[PDB]
Design a protein around this ligand. Structure first.
Ligand SMILES: [Mn+2]
Ligand SMILES: [Mn+2]
Length: 283
């Protein structure tokens, strides 16, 4: 598989400055050369330019176009970007190519909000509710079809800041979510194995990884850290098991904010996880 990297320096889905530099902070940390050293022929398609609502719309519209074309040549889009609102454009570009796309949402949050239920209106807390598809029309109907995905095809892994209307929708919708409780109880191995089997009926699986899914001690450079998260090791285990399964057909790594990071510790971790996702082995 030929890795197509697509930078999305999007910060307009959130109020904190700096997450638009995530792509550069990951590129630095040697994403390309590490993937080339692994045997992949990787093409870096650069960053999508950005100039709330409309700029979120236009930018995601352009992101969806590139991801769509990438999959058209059957290459594997690796987005990497700014705030999680870019998943709207990413999933809009991949879902149409799969009769039954699965989604692994690696995140401390559910991002299942809506501008009415949102206490901030920050769209990086809506991309999964959008896309499912409940939310602002122009957002839900991105790329002219909706919903992009089915709640029964989503598995959230890492939830620990999910209060209020999000929880109600989870149980009413039938999403499978592994909160920190299930990870602590069953261990990450079982969680992934149950995730794989659960998603075994999908034509493809998109990995949407929010770096704040990891504990802030391991991923401090995020805009909305939440204590008691997934460890660096557990995260590598999950990536390694996902690779061995061969189910992941697209991936995005979001919310890296160098302005809140410690010497690009979070950007480095992001590259390290991509390596494991794309087949890097200790032995
Ligand atoms: Mn998120
Ligand atoms: Mn999050």
């Amino acid at each position: 598989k030929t890795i197509s990297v697509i930078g999305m320096p999007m910060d307009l889905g959130q109020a904190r400055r700096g997450v638009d530099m995530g792509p550069s902070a990951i590129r630095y940390a040697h994403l390309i050369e590490r993937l080339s050293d692994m045997g992949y022929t990787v093409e870096d398609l650069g960053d999508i330019p950005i100039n709330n609502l409309n700029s979120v719309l236009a930018g995601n519209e352009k992101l969806a176009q590139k991801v769509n074309k990438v999959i058209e040549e059957k290459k594997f889009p690796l987005v990497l970007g700014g705030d999680h609102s870019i998943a709207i454009g990413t999933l809009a570009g991949t879902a149409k190519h799969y009769d039954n796309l699965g989604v692994i949402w690696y995140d401390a949050h559910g991002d299942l909000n809506t501008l009415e239920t949102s206490p901030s209106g920050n769209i990086h807390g809506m991309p999964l509710a959008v896309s499912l598809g409940i939310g602002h029309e122009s957002l839900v109907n991105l790329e002219g079809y909706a919903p992009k995905i089915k709640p029964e095809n989503v598995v959230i892994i890492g939830a620990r800041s999910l209060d209020e209307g999000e929880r109600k929708y989870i149980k009413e919708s039938g999403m499978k979510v592994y909160t920190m409780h299930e990870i602590d109880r069953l261990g990450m191995t079982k969680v992934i194995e149950e995730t794989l089997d659960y998603l075994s009926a999908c034509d493809g699986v998109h990995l949407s990884l929010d770096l704040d899914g990891l504990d802030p001690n391991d991923a401090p450079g995020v805009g909305t850290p939440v204590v008691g998260g997934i460890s660096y090791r557990e995260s590598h285990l999950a990536m390694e098991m996902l690779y061995d399964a061969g189910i992941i057909t697209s991936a995005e790594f979001v919310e890296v904010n160098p302005i809140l990071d410690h010497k690009n510790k979070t950007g480095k971790t992001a590259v390290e996880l991509v390596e494991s996702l794309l087949g890097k082995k200790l032995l």
